[PDB]
């Protein structure tokens, strides 16, 4: 019955921890890229941007979440809406896809609709998060279809040779992309259980997405960075 529907100190403490890790990753990548040859630096900068944006969003959430506003719903169904995460995601999820797109020869037209589907997905999530009642699930389902669309586009360079830079990169591209898709599918499950269904509380959703964000941003970035270094060195 809409358990624990407001952020408490548990969720705030989790956000400060993720803030610290995101900030540290951004700093470490920023020092590291100074030592690396010019062809690799764009990939470092993309990941510095990702972790910096995420750190800023988690700073905002940790400073403000205890205000227990805004909310959606009334009476016993009222639940806090944490929306800073969506502002993070509309900038970082295109950059996370760009990490892999840079390993391919995708044409601009294809990059355009993959990135468009990604941005639409986030837009549907935040609209749904503020929607009271059953229409929230229309936004949710269309956002899920957008995830399927962007995933299909990202999968195509695996088996379309004309979309590949080198057959060499296919193993790492495939493995990194499967890791990404696995993690990204968990986000709508958390949303459906929390923001949508009010089945899990706000601190639980914060912790779940804090774990996902650490896996999907700095740990993923280390995998991408290792990949481009190994490929360039051979």
Ligand X SMILES: *C/C=C(C)/C=C/C=C(C)/C=C/C1=C(C)CCCC1(C)C
Ligand Y SMILES: CCCCCCCC/C=C\CCCCCCCC(=O)OC[C@@H](O)CO
Ligand Z SMILES: CCCCCCCCCCCCCCCC
Ligand U SMILES: CCCCCCCCCCCCCC
Residue 66 has a CB neighbour count (10 Å cut-off) of 14
Query: Which two tokens mark 202?
Result: 């706000």
**Residue number, 37 or 133, with CB nearest to ligand Z:** 133
The correct pick among 40, 48, 129, 183 for binding ligand CCCCCCCCCC (CB under 6 A) is: 48
**Residue number, 72 or 225, with CB nearest to ligand CCCCCCCCCC:** 225
The residues with which 79 forms a beta bridge, in sequence order, are 72
Among positions 77-106, residues that touch ligand Y (CB under 6 A) are: 84, 87-88, 90-91, 94-95, 98, 101-102, 104-106
CA 7 – CA 16 distance, rounded (Å): 13
Over its C-alpha atoms, the chain yields an Rg (Å, rounded) of: 18
Q: Is residue 219 within the footprint of ligand CCCCCCCCCC (CB under 6 A)?
A: yes
Q: Is residue 24 within the footprint of ligand Z (CB under 6 A)?
A: no
The correct pick among 141, 158, 181, 211 for binding ligand Z (CB under 6 A) is: 141
Q: Is residue 110 within the footprint of ligand U (CB under 6 A)?
A: no
Helix or strand (DSSP H, E) at 79: strand 79-80
Q: Is residue 188 within the footprint of ligand X (CB under 6 A)?
A: yes
CB of 135 to ligand U, least distance (A): 33
CB of 134 to ligand Y, least distance (A): 25
3-state helix, strand, coil in the chain (%, to 5): 80, 5, 15
Binding-site size, ligand X (CB under 6 A): 19
Residue 7 · residue 82 · CB < 8 Å = yes
Among positions 144-183, residues that touch ligand Z (CB under 6 A) are: 144-145, 148
CA 227 – CA 234 distance, rounded (Å): 11
CA 234 – CA 32 distance, rounded (Å): 20
CB of 225 to ligand CCCCCCCCCC, least distance (A): 11
CA 22 – CA 218 distance, rounded (Å): 7
Q: Which residues bind ligand Z (CB under 6 A)?
A: 137, 141, 144-145, 148, 192
């Amino acid at each position: 019955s809409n358990p624990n529907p407001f952020q408490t100190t548990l969720g705030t403490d989790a956000q400060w921890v993720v803030f610290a890790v995101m900030a540290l990753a951004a700093i470490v990548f920023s020092i590291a890229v100074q030592f690396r040859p010019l062809p690799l630096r764009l990939t470092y900068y993309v990941n510095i941007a990702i972790c910096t944006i995420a750190a800023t969003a988690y700073y905002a959430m940790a400073v403000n979440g205890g205000d227990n506003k805004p909310t959606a719903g009334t009476g016993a169904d009222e639940r806090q809406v944490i929306y800073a995460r969506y502002i993070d995601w509309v900038f970082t999820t295109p950059l996370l896809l760009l990490d892999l797109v840079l390993l391919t020869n995708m044409p601009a037209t294809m990059i355009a609709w993959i990135m468009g589907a990604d941005i639409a997905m986030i837009a549907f999530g935040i609209i749904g998060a503020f929607t009271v009642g059953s229409y929230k699930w229309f936004y949710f389902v269309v956002g899920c279809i957008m995830l399927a669309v962007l995933a299909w586009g990202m999968i195509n360079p695996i088996f379309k040779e004309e979309l590949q830079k080198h057959k060499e990169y296919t193993g790492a591209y495939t493995t990194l992309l499967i890791y990404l898709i696995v993690l990204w599918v968990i986000y709508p499950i958390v949303w459906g259980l929390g923001a949508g269904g009010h089945i899990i509380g706000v601190d639980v959703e914060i912790i779940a997405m804090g774990i996902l964000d650490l896996l999907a941003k700095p740990l993923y970035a280390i995998g991408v960075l290792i990949t481009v270094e190994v490929v360039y060195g051979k």
